[PDB]
């Protein structure tokens, strides 16, 4: 449209050392993933799924999450900064 966008994708194991900014992730799966010092800034997450995930020094800054599930995640308040959720389901850590 006029924004960067990466959809219908399933990331299976590990993400390390990347600062992702300005992205829309449409229906992306993060399943069994380990995040290590990864940073998403100024991005949008739509109809995505977080499942059985681990996060070390990773952060979601100025991110809107829409229609996404966090299921068995290690996510804490201090990880999402100046944050926003919209119809997001939270299943337990």
């Amino acid at each position: 449209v006029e924004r960067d966008k990466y959809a219908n994708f399933t990331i299976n194991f590990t993400m390390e050392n990347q600062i992702h900014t300005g992205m829309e992730y449409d229906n992306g799966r993060f399943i069994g993933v380990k995040f290590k010092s990864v940073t998403f800034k100024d991005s949008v997450f739509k109809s995505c799924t977080f499942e059985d995930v681990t996060s070390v020094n990773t952060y979601f800054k100025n991110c809107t999450f829409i229609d996404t599930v966090f299921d068995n995640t290690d996510f804490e308040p201090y990880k999402f900064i100046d944050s926003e959720f919209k119809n997001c389901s939270f299943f337990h850590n």
Binding site: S47, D67, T68, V69, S83, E84, F85, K86, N87, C88, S89, F90, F91, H92
Partner: protein
């Protein structure tokens, strides 16, 4: 009694009062094809019903008492433009005099006003930062009564919420017509559900309202969580009122395994709008007809219960000849139930009770109401006749008290 009685009959909405006032429906008013008396109004100029009253019963007095009754299903607010955006849904205001039902984030509001610039508001407030609401996206019975010598009263489900003084007023001259329409609503995807709209030429007392609550509740037809008729061949997520921070699961299919209550059921959350418990959780049930001979589930209807595991349809069953007081339930493959007990009598009342499924064998004997029990710290679904026994002369909440939740646009959670 009624001077207005908006009811759907044949293929048209009408007034069942002698005054038989004329109703002007718009092109874009939706009727529930299962209960057409359930009316759906959109934020569109064409989504509007207008009642042109007979000039006699038009309110133009300073001492005549009146009341209005209706049921409403108000979907959850999803967006921030709807915080502090009061919007009128029913209007009998002519030159800022008359009355109106208005809505706003977490509120249903009533306003009267006279010809001389004085009003009064009564307000029922409800939260959306709450695990399980009685009021979000569920049919609630609203009744508003007025007495000119004292107060206006707002009752929800037969029970008084608030009362505010109106003795200071004031001759009120209301509109000659009532407009059912969302006016002033800044949320483009917004609607209400409305049904059973009544007007009365007096201030109803607190027993007349309970009675109207009990008759219009359609005791004799089971309901889902939201208040609509319970249906066959329709997936429902399950909510146990006794233990509501748990959802239903199956460890394994077959008489080998068991259905159980798993926790903790999570949350749904929109920032500054709502934080609720998740409702779309665990194994879905489907109520199957025993007698294939209308898909409305009624009191004492013998059924089966299907169960969805990993996308596949199974059967709720048990052996009641197993030793012990509670008979533990399993999800069986369907062509393999044999002569295990699976036939369930569905219960609306006795008298109303939230305990909905009474398990029987194939020779007419009660196995018990489906509920749950703790074994080795595993809350397994069981049937037991203790349930059927505590239901004598009590109406409290038990582990057999259930709620069926289908997916709905008013709730707006991601199904999974």
């Amino acid at each position: 009694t009624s001077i207005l009685n908006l009811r759907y009959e044949s293929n048209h909405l009408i007034d069942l009062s002698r005054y038989a006032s004329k109703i002007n429906i718009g092109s874009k008013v939706n009727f529930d094809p299962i209960d057409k008396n359930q009316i759906q109004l959109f934020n569109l100029e064409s989504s509007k019903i207008e009642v042109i009253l007979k000039n006699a019963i038009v309110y133009n007095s300073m001492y005549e008492n009146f009341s209005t009754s209706f049921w409403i299903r108000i979907p959850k607010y999803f967006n921030s433009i709807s915080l502090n955006n009061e919007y009128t849904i029913i209007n009998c205001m002519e030159n800022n005099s008359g009355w109106k039902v208005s809505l706003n984030y977490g509120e249903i509001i009533w306003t009267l006003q006279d010809t001389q610039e004085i009003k009064q508001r009564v307000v029922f407030k409800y939260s959306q930062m709450i695990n399980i609401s009685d009021y979000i996206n569920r049919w609630i019975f609203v009744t508003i009564t007025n007495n000119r010598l004292n107060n206006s009263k707002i009752y929800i489900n037969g029970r008084l919420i608030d009362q505010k003084p109106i003795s200071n007023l004031g001759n009120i001259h209301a509109s000659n017509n009532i407009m059912f329409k969302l006016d002033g609503c800044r949320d483009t995807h917004r609607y209400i559900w409305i049904k059973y709209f009544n007007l009365f030429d007096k201030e109803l007392n607190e027993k007349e309202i309970k009675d109207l609550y009990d008759n219009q509740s359609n005791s004799g037809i089971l309901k889902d969580f939201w208040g609509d008729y319970l249906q066959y061949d329709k997936p429902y997520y399950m909510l146990n009122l006794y233990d509501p921070n748990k959802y239903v699961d199956v460890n394994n299919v077959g008489i080998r395994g068991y259905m159980y209550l798993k926790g903790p059921r999570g949350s749904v959350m929109t920032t500054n709008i709502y934080l609720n418990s998740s409702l779309y959780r665990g194994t879905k049930f489907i109520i199957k007809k025993y007698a294939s001979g209308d898909n409305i589930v009624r009191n004492n209807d013998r059924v089966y219960i299907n169960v969805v595991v990993k996308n596949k349809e199974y059967r709720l069953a048990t052996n009641a000849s197993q030793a012990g007081v509670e008979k533990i339930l399993s999800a069986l493959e369907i062509p393999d139930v044999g002569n295990l007990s699976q036939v369930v009598v569905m219960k609306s009342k006795n008298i109303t009770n939230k305990c909905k499924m009474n398990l029987q064998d194939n020779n007419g004997n009660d196995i018990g109401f489906i509920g749950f029990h703790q074994f080795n710290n595993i809350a397994k679904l069981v049937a037991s006749n203790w349930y059927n026994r505590q239901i004598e002369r009590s109406s409290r909440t038990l582990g057999c008290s259930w709620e069926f939740i289908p997916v709905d646009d008013g709730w707006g959670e991601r199904p999974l």
